[PDB]
Amino acid sequence: LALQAKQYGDFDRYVLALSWQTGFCQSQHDRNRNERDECRLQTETTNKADFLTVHGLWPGLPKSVAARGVDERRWMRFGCATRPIPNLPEARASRMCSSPETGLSLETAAKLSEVMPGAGGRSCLERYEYAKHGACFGFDPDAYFGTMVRLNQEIKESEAGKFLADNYGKTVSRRDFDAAFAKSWGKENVKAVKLTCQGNPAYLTEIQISIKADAINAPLSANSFLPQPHPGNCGKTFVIDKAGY
Ligand SMILES: [Ca+2]
């Protein structure tokens, strides 16, 4: 349905954060972090684009919150937990299952799980994500996570998703990634994307896309995005990491 804020709704954008799951798993492994079922359970899939999973949907800094002294960096660090407001409990990556249950329906949880391996189970990524980016806005969890699922699907089905699939395990240039994104959404919207990489050579771990809050409930189009200042830390070229360490 439609995603709507009940409070602090005066933000202008959402950042759709999509993990390149294989890369995420590779990174956790390279940094010597204990393996989460997510990754050890991770297998090769027929549609390589399906490795592009949902991390979250992050509302930008609300004007009402910025008005109270909160800057962009502080909002990025604590989200709903920023002080003086919204001042909700801080969501911590070290205890995601300690965040409140979201109240998400079984149906939405099922859909969410297929594209967010960290959701539910003993990981509870959705509890953390909702606590940090949705609770203070009073978002309906079903509309919230349902929207992430849809947006992720639209990205995977676009030339950006096809680009990742066609170049699975290969080294690509940011130039060509941008060309693919631009093919589906326009050259002037290439700036709406921030890529995150790990290692050297760099390999993809995440894609963050800035979307107009006004367009969040409609199918993505060349009028749905907002340029943002950060291209990311991938450099000119990077590897589309394949499953397996
Ligand atoms: Ca890998």
Phi first, then psi: give them for residue 133, nearest 5 degrees. -125, -5
How remote is the CA of residue 243 from the centroid of ligand 1, in Å? 5
Choose the catalytic residue: 55, 157, 159, 206.
Answer: 55
DSSP string, the chain: -----SSS----EEEEEEEEHHHHHHHHHHTTPPPPHHHHS----SSGGGGEEEEEEEE---HHHHTTT--HHHHHHHGGG-TTTT-PPPP-GGGGGGSPP----HHHHHHHHHH-TTSSTTT-HHHHHHHHHTGGGT--HHHHHHHHHHHHHHHHHSHHHHHHHHTTTSEEEHHHHHHHHHHHH-GGGGGGEEEEEETTTTEEEEEEEEEEGGGTTS---TTSB---S--BS--SEEE-PPS--
Experimental method: X-ray
Task: Verify whether residue 129 is a known catalytic residue.
Answer: yes
Domain ranges within the chain, ordered by starting residue: 1-245
38, 126, 129, 206: the catalytic one is 129
Ion ligand 1 — residues with CB under 5 Å? Answer: 22, 26, 241
This structure's resolution (angstroms)? 1.4
Considering the domain delimited by 1-245, tell me its CATH architecture: Alpha-Beta Complex (3.90)
Q: Ligand 1 center to residue 137 CA distance, Å?
A: 36
The alpha carbon of 47 and the centre of ligand 1 are apart by a number of angstroms equal to: 16
Distance (Å, whole) CA 182 – CA 235: 18
